[PDB]
Motif scaffolding. Sequence first.
Motif, PDB file in Angstrom:
ATOM      1  N   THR C  66       0.829  -1.198   0.000  1.00  0.00           N
ATOM      2  CA  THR C  66       0.000   0.000   0.000  1.00  0.00           C
ATOM      3  C   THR C  66       0.866   1.251   0.000  1.00  0.00           C
ATOM      4  N   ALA C  67       1.891   1.277   0.854  1.00  0.00           N
ATOM      5  CA  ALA C  67       2.789   2.425   0.889  1.00  0.00           C
ATOM      6  C   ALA C  67       3.552   2.561  -0.419  1.00  0.00           C
ATOM      7  N   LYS C  68       4.074   1.450  -0.926  1.00  0.00           N
ATOM      8  CA  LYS C  68       4.830   1.478  -2.170  1.00  0.00           C
ATOM      9  C   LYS C  68       3.976   1.902  -3.362  1.00  0.00           C
ATOM     10  N   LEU C  69       2.646   1.798  -3.264  1.00  0.00           N
ATOM     11  CA  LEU C  69       1.771   2.400  -4.270  1.00  0.00           C
ATOM     12  C   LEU C  69       1.582   3.888  -4.013  1.00  0.00           C
ATOM     13  N   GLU C  70       1.292   4.242  -2.764  1.00  0.00           N
ATOM     14  CA  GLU C  70       1.041   5.633  -2.420  1.00  0.00           C
ATOM     15  C   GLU C  70       2.133   6.534  -2.984  1.00  0.00           C
ATOM     16  N   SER C  71       3.392   6.219  -2.679  1.00  0.00           N
ATOM     17  CA  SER C  71       4.496   7.078  -3.094  1.00  0.00           C
ATOM     18  C   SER C  71       4.585   7.202  -4.611  1.00  0.00           C
ATOM     19  N   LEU C  72       4.143   6.185  -5.353  1.00  0.00           N
ATOM     20  CA  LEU C  72       4.199   6.273  -6.808  1.00  0.00           C
ATOM     21  C   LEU C  72       3.173   7.248  -7.357  1.00  0.00           C
ATOM     22  N   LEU C  73       2.045   7.420  -6.666  1.00  0.00           N
ATOM     23  CA  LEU C  73       1.097   8.453  -7.060  1.00  0.00           C
ATOM     24  C   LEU C  73       1.568   9.827  -6.610  1.00  0.00           C
ATOM     25  N   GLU C  74       2.170   9.911  -5.421  1.00  0.00           N
ATOM     26  CA  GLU C  74       2.745  11.173  -4.979  1.00  0.00           C
ATOM     27  C   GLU C  74       3.672  11.749  -6.042  1.00  0.00           C
ATOM     28  N   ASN C  75       4.414  10.886  -6.737  1.00  0.00           N
ATOM     29  CA  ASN C  75       5.323  11.355  -7.781  1.00  0.00           C
ATOM     30  C   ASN C  75       4.571  11.661  -9.072  1.00  0.00           C
ATOM     31  N   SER C  76       3.685  10.758  -9.495  1.00  0.00           N
ATOM     32  CA  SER C  76       2.968  10.954 -10.752  1.00  0.00           C
ATOM     33  C   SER C  76       2.004  12.131 -10.665  1.00  0.00           C
ATOM     34  N   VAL C  77       1.309  12.273  -9.535  1.00  0.00           N
ATOM     35  CA  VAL C  77       0.389  13.393  -9.353  1.00  0.00           C
ATOM     36  C   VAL C  77       1.153  14.710  -9.306  1.00  0.00           C
ATOM     37  N   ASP C  78       2.157  14.798  -8.433  1.00  0.00           N
ATOM     38  CA  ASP C  78       2.977  15.999  -8.395  1.00  0.00           C
ATOM     39  C   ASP C  78       3.510  16.320  -9.780  1.00  0.00           C
ATOM     40  N   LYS C  79       3.817  15.290 -10.566  1.00  0.00           N
ATOM     41  CA  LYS C  79       4.329  15.502 -11.915  1.00  0.00           C
ATOM     42  C   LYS C  79       3.248  16.053 -12.834  1.00  0.00           C
ATOM     43  N   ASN C  80       2.099  15.379 -12.897  1.00  0.00           N
ATOM     44  CA  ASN C  80       1.087  15.712 -13.892  1.00  0.00           C
ATOM     45  C   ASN C  80       0.333  16.991 -13.558  1.00  0.00           C
ATOM     46  N   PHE C  81       0.219  17.337 -12.277  1.00  0.00           N
ATOM     47  CA  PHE C  81      -0.477  18.553 -11.878  1.00  0.00           C
ATOM     48  C   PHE C  81       0.418  19.784 -11.824  1.00  0.00           C
ATOM     49  N   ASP C  82       1.744  19.629 -11.848  1.00  0.00           N
ATOM     50  CA  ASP C  82       2.587  20.793 -12.099  1.00  0.00           C
ATOM     51  C   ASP C  82       2.514  21.215 -13.562  1.00  0.00           C
ATOM     52  N   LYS C  83       2.469  20.252 -14.487  1.00  0.00           N
ATOM     53  CA  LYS C  83       2.185  20.591 -15.879  1.00  0.00           C
ATOM     54  C   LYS C  83       0.856  21.328 -15.998  1.00  0.00           C
ATOM     55  N   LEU C  84      -0.168  20.858 -15.282  1.00  0.00           N
ATOM     56  CA  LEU C  84      -1.427  21.590 -15.196  1.00  0.00           C
ATOM     57  C   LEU C  84      -1.187  23.017 -14.716  1.00  0.00           C
ATOM     58  N   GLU C  85      -0.535  23.159 -13.556  1.00  0.00           N
ATOM     59  CA  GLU C  85      -0.217  24.483 -13.028  1.00  0.00           C
ATOM     60  C   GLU C  85       0.403  25.359 -14.103  1.00  0.00           C
ATOM     61  N   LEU C  86       1.197  24.758 -14.985  1.00  0.00           N
ATOM     62  CA  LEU C  86       1.852  25.510 -16.047  1.00  0.00           C
ATOM     63  C   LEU C  86       0.935  25.686 -17.251  1.00  0.00           C
ATOM     64  N   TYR C  87       0.278  24.613 -17.691  1.00  0.00           N
ATOM     65  CA  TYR C  87      -0.552  24.731 -18.881  1.00  0.00           C
ATOM     66  C   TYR C  87      -1.678  25.733 -18.674  1.00  0.00           C
ATOM     67  N   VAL C  88      -2.195  25.837 -17.447  1.00  0.00           N
ATOM     68  CA  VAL C  88      -3.302  26.750 -17.177  1.00  0.00           C
ATOM     69  C   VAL C  88      -2.818  28.193 -17.202  1.00  0.00           C
ATOM     70  N   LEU C  89      -1.805  28.502 -16.394  1.00  0.00           N
ATOM     71  CA  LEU C  89      -1.332  29.872 -16.271  1.00  0.00           C
ATOM     72  C   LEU C  89      -0.789  30.421 -17.581  1.00  0.00           C
ATOM     73  N   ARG C  90      -0.524  29.563 -18.567  1.00  0.00           N
ATOM     74  CA  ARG C  90       0.062  29.979 -19.835  1.00  0.00           C
ATOM     75  C   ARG C  90      -0.930  30.011 -20.988  1.00  0.00           C
ATOM     76  N   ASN C  91      -1.978  29.184 -20.955  1.00  0.00           N
ATOM     77  CA  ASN C  91      -2.920  29.063 -22.062  1.00  0.00           C
ATOM     78  C   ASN C  91      -4.351  29.400 -21.690  1.00  0.00           C
ATOM     79  N   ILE C  92      -4.754  29.143 -20.449  1.00  0.00           N
ATOM     80  CA  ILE C  92      -6.111  29.418 -19.989  1.00  0.00           C
ATOM     81  C   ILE C  92      -6.165  30.815 -19.385  1.00  0.00           C
TER      82      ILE C  92
END
Lengths: 90, 32, 114
Positions: C66-92
């Motif tokens: 369970t922990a070894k899954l949690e941390s993999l989302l912590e990385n993927s989410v932090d990754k994919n939602f920083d692109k969001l943070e960028l794609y929004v402030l630049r295009n939206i």
Amino acid sequence: EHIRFQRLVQVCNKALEESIRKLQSWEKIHECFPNYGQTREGIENLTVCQQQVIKLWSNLSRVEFDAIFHERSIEEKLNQLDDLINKARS
Amino acid sequence: NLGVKSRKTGLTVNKTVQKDEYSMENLNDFFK
Amino acid sequence: NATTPTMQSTSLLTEHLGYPPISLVDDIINAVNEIMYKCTNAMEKYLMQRNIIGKKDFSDEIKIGTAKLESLLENSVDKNFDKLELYVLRNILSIPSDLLEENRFRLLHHEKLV
């Protein structure tokens, strides 16, 4: 002509779909529970998780973001902003 | 700061021209 | 219109929105993280009351899994939602040049009044 908000919905959904994809793979799920997943009941129980977690993921995120988009009227602010740059370019 | 720096990871949008269509840059290429 | 954020955009958009552009991004990142942990916690307890199959106890393997899954989302989410943070402030939440080269102030002030 209203095109920016639909984007906001497309970029949110796009970030979520990518955020969960490694859990849609039965392989990586079994890698985290190799011995537990080598039992019949274990395989049954893990299947119930990934399919319910994903549904829970999708539903919770869908209902909050729709709520956040409401509490900040973003659909309207962006529709006002899309039709307002058009009036300026004209 | 808010142009290229992600607050908690700093992901520079260094993917050159990106790909502009429909008056915006398309997600597909942006997210890979 | 794709564009790099500027202080006028942040200042104008803050006035049109009633909140800084980033506040909406905060509500999203903060929200998806709460869901992340709510799912993992829900998944660990589903398994811990199913940790014994037959006669063997897999409690150890579940905690680590369970922990070894949690941390993999912590990385993927932090990754994919920083692109969001960028794609929004630049295009939206974005500004062209047509409006800060020749007074966007007119139309915002125009909006709030007439």
